[PDB]
């Protein structure tokens, strides 16, 4: 609908009442939100990122403890 709403918004007097997309009824605002929404490949590709984010966040936080000392050591060099 990204290329469909653009045509609709090019003429200010052609209302978009609603409709059903894949057995799901939407309003005009739902269509607008659906338009700004990414595709299946992008959304599913980011789905695995969020599910594995919990493990990734745990590893980053555990590895952050040695990095805290390095940042403080680098900060001291920045001071002097």
């Amino acid at each position: 609908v990204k290329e469909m709403v653009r045509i609709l918004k090019g003429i200010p007097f052609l209302p978009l009442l609603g409709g059903c997309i894949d057995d799901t009824i939407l309003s005009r605002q739902g269509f607008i939100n659906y338009s700004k929404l990414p595709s299946l490949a992008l959304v599913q590709g980011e789905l695995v990122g969020g599910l594995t984010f919990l493990t990734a966040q745990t590893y980053s936080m555990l590895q952050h403890q040695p990095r805290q000392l390095t940042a403080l050591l680098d900060q001291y060099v920045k001071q002097q």
Partner: peptide
Amino acid sequence: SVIADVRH
């Protein structure tokens, strides 16, 4: 300009 505002 004719504006057709649509809400639910």
